[PDB]
Amino acid sequence: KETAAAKFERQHMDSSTSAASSSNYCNQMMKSRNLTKDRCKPVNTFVHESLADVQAVCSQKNVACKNGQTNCYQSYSTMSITDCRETGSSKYPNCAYKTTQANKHIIVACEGNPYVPVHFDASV
């Protein structure tokens, strides 16, 4: 198994880079993190912040999750993120993505003890 928290770091954390390196970023990252293993995950966001910074988001601004649950939190400051959105010629198993860099507040769902991020909800 893989814990909720470890899975979040696997699919969303990329601290080794401050931004989206190039157009190549998403094709390599999605594959590396095994996000294009059973299908091409449609969209995925990577956060280039320290892990301590992303975890502190659980004590930040509490907001409603897209699913109606109340365990989502919004970062007070903008973070550096990269959005990976699937393309047209992207055909499984040859998934193709468009790398998109930006700075936005992130919204994550937290849970557990300790209370850690387990799901990425949105970026605004």
Side-chain angles (χ1 to χ4, degrees), residues 94-115:
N94 300 117
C95 310
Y97 300 83
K98 171 173 60 63
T99 292
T100 298
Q101 178 65 208
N103 281 270
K104 301 174 92 197
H105 299 281
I106 60 172
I107 301 167
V108 295
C110 301
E111 84 192 9
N113 174 44
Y115 204 61

Side-chain angles (χ1 to χ4, degrees), residues 12-25:
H12 303 292
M13 295 302 303
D14 180 22
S15 310
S16 328
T17 78
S18 41
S21 27
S22 52
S23 34
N24 244 333
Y25 186 80

